Amino acid sequence: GFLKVIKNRAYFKKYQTQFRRRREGKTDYYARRKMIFQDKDKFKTPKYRVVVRITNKTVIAQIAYSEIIGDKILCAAYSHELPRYGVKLGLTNYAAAYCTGLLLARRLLQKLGMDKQFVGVSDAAKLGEDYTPEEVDERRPFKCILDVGLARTTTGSKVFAVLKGMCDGGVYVPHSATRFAGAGENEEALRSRILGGHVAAYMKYLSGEDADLYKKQFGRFIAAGIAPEALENIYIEAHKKIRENPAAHKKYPTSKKLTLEQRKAAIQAKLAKLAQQA
Amino acid sequence: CKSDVMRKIKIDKLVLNISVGESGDRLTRAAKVLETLTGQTPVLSEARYTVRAFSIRNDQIACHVTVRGAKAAEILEKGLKVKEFELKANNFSATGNFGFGIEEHIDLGLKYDPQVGIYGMDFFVVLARPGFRVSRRKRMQDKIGRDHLLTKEDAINWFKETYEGIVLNK
Amino acid sequence: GRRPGRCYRLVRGHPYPKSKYCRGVPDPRIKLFDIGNRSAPCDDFPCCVHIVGLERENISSEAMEAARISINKNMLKYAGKDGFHVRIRIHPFHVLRINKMLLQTGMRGAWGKSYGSCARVKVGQVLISGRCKEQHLPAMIKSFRLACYKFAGRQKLVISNKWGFTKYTKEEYQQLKKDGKIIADGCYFKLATTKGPLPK
Amino acid sequence: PLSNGRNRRTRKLFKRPFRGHGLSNTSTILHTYKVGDYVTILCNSSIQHGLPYKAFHGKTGRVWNVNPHAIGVMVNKKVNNRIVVKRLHISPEHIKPSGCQKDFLERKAAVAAIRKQNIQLKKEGKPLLPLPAKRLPKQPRPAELIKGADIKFTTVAPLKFEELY
Amino acid sequence: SKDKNRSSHNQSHKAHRNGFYKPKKSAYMSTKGMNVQVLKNTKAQRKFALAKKLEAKKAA
RNA sequence: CAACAUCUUGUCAAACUAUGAAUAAACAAAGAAGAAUUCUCAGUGUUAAAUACACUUCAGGAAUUUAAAU
RNA sequence: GGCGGCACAUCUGUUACAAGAUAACGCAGGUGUCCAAAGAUGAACUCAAUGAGGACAGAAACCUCAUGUAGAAUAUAAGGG
RNA sequence: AGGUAGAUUACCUGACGUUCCCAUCUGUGUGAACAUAAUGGUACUGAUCAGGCUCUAAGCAUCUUUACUUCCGUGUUCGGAUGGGAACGGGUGUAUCCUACUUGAUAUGAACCUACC
Helix, strand or coil: CCCCCCCCHHHHCCCCCCCHHHHCCCCCCCCCCCCCCCCCCCCCCCCEEEEEEECCCCEEEEEEECCCCCCEEEEECCCCCHHHHCCCCCCCCHHHHHHHHHHHHHHHHHHHCCCCCCCCCCCCCCCCCCCCCCCECCECCCECCEECCCCCCCCCCCHHHHHHHHHHHCCECCCCCCCCCCCCCCHHHHHHHHCCHHHHHHHHHHHHHCHHHHHHHCHHHHHHCCCHHHCHHHHHHHHHHHHCCCCCCCCCCCCCCCCHHHHHHHHHHHHHHHHHCC | CCHHHHHCCEEEEEEEECCCCCCCCHHHHHHHHHHHHHCCCCEEEECCCCCHHHCCCCCEEEEEEECCCHHHHHHHHHHHHHHCCEEEHHHECCCCCEEEEECCCCCCCCCCCCCCCCCCEEEEEEEECCCHHHHCCCCCCCCCCCCCCCCHHHHHHHHCCCCCCEEECC | CCCCCCCCCCCCCCCCCCCCCCCCCCCCCCCCCEEECCCCCHHHCCEEEEEEECCCCEEECHHHHHHHHHHHHHHHCCCCCCCEEEEECCCCCEEEEECCCCCCCCCCCCCCEEEEEEEECCCCEEEEEEEECHHHCHHHHHHHHHHHHHCCCCEEEEEECECCCCCCECCHHHHHHHHCCEEECCCCEEECCCCCCCCC | CCCCCCCCCCCCCCCCCCCCCCCCCCCCCCCCCCCCCEEEECCCCCCCCCCCCHHHCCCEEEEEEECCCCEEEEEEEECCCEEEEEEEEECHHHEEECCCCCCHHHHHHHHHHHHHHHHHHHHHCCCCCCCCCCCCCCCCCCCCCCCCCCCCCCCCCCCCCCCCC | CCCCCCCCCCHHHHCCCCCCECCCCCCCCCCCCCCHHHHHHHHHHHHHHHHHHHHHHHHC
């Protein structure tokens, strides 16, 4: 019928497929070749970036520098090793996103060897104020760059919590404190969110509205016995237990490829069935 | 434990536009009715091309608004109750959506004035399944599979089950 | 009137098609390029005789319409409307220019206005080709020789051993027809395609 | 008669390669050019800022100075009857690493491998190896036998004419 | 009285009488416009070697 | 009838083009002075710090081999 | 020679001959301007068109879904991006 | 086997049906708070009731496309060179370079770094 199908072989010949990792919608190539172009007078000096990605259950943070063969990863601290440090549930919140940033910074500094002169902040009162690391003696801080990928930089985004842990952990990341959970109100608004403030105020409110909604939203919280008042002191102990020790099969074959001889023999059977049908 | 729970055709949108051919004055009242009917401020749509036969480029022409979920479920009943669920079989697009157009806004007769006039309306319903987000997310935006996508027949049965509407092939 | 044919015979200049840059070209004198019974199947007419041009020149569009008329009148009179298929295989895609000079006029300081249309041929390029049954071949070779008198230069009539406008010889078309590699389209054949999905 | 534009006669000289539009690679901005390297200039019409003159497209030059965002490249330009030295500053997007010395830099390795053995054979007293033979044009082939057990013959004669119509 | 506007006849055989004057090897060794950081390291060392060379000359 | 799709057919483009010769253009085939190897080695920077890297008469200096590279 | 025109300063495509230069009163055209945004930067989004649908509404008004390698737009002439 | 970041950017693309998901990724419930718009659809944030339904990924087909190889074809064209042929038009011979469309056979990936299984 009246088709005018614009898919014909005259249309594929002129086709120009995009870059592979852009065809999947995973890499913004226009704004990646700006985090990778190092000054040409620095010959093969690595340019580290912090690759922050949030899945449905895990907060991924890696420190990577590019190469012609492929991007190389220096250090990586996921958020599924938090159960080792105490945090058992809610591994994707704003508070657990600060821990993995702090977990990475202290894991990186221990690996390089600058964990003694770069301590950052350690107390709980100063968790809400921006801390930019400074030159120590004659040794500059480690310098990275946040690579948020395809995530909008809204005023309270989690990806700047991972940045928050880095600068408070010692590693220097260039930033401005106008996109944290603060950037307004006060520092305690940011401090509360780093310590599960926005989560504790939920169950102290849902438990007062409906006891079945509380079961639905926080089913695994109640069974573990984590009362809302205990979130501040489980995250604080997590930070204390990260600094003191941050230093870090089965295969299922699926389909296999059909060989040429089997491929050509199938057609002959299909042709024979077609011929024997008439 | 069958995965049939992940094919529940649901109403995820409903658009009501009042395409009046005049800019302002009359249009501003066409937004007021859509405010009471839906509860959210509507948008204004401007002309795409200027045609002398229609007295129309940047001038506001129509006003449409979208509702979803519970709020759009009840307004679908009102538009159907006017038609008494007698929707023609040619009202279903091959993409799985169906629509209909009413002429008089019934609204509320308690506070009604002749100043506003009588404005027609168009109802358009978009159906979906759990998993349609893969074509609307920002990261890894993809295309839904053809087996998961709705059909003209798939939309007919949904309308012939929940509302028990009778489809006329006239 | 019209300039002598010897003025625009040698092929000179870059090709000058009618386009948006060359506006105002008189239409070609020929409009019907295929004459005879164009809907006859391929197997009906096996005998094919060509006209081959042996000079590099511009066969003007006035020499195709004047030649198509001669073949049509001398083939309907001898064979019949249903007994032949003659196809002109040159189209007038070149525009000759003329600088009409009126001595109270400009000197050689201007370009030329469009004159007509001609087709650039070369050596060994078939101009006109036809197919007909065996019983009417002598009545078409005679008509083709009469049509050469309206062309310029040297033309050679070649009796091809191939089929009716196909590429296979008069016997290879029989081999491919009996095997099943030939499928008709009403006027031409189609090869049996051994590529693409297997049908049901 | 042409014009005096900077980028004149560039319908096919600046046109991108077929199905090569859009962004360049990521090794274009990641190769490391050091002073003294042989690089090839190749004007990139996608990036207008800093486009080198169309007369240097495809010329081969020596990197003389590496600046933070641009690579100095010097080439020889021909004038009325003298050859001058041109000193451009091309961004890495508009230049490509020339492999003119691809053959030469593999001859050096072969000689260096041999010379490494000669410093060990001499120390231990063994007869040192001879250097690789130099390159010569295709020399006249010598005389070689042909067996009569795996041979076959095909008569060659002028072909009888077959008509093409 | 018109004339011939231009002709490249003989203009290339003229240039090959005295052949293409290649540039001397001193033309390839200019250090003008080089990296300002590189030119400050090279200056800072040439001054250092010269100071230690002239002091040794004065000692003897 | 037509019109719209689709599979073929005949013929074209200086201001159309996928592919694309021959002839050409500009490089290399060993001149901080004809190569190389080993040891030692400093000044400024880059760097998170360098023993990495860059420039410094292949900074400099001392031994052994070496005239070879269409 | 005059009258006509600007080939007198200048740009795009072609004649132009796959490096550079390259003629005719050769061809098809363009400039003596326009812009506080039509400069700079960040973020979001995808365009012309077609198919299917929705009162008046139809070949053209507004809306939804699917396809859509740029067939849109980018101040202008053309060629590039 | 899976996720994150990649390099080469169709052997990677498009259409038709397919096979597992134990971990992982995705889809999935929701809107109090930063944040978001006409719509918690998008982005944002909080979470774990179910799911392999679409993703993603592994495979299929005389699959369009695309990437190598042969053939097409020494046929097109061309560098060099007559006191060679022709009234022209054009086209030999010699010493040489040598395409393209098509078609036929093959292929539908490779690899680099960190984590978990």
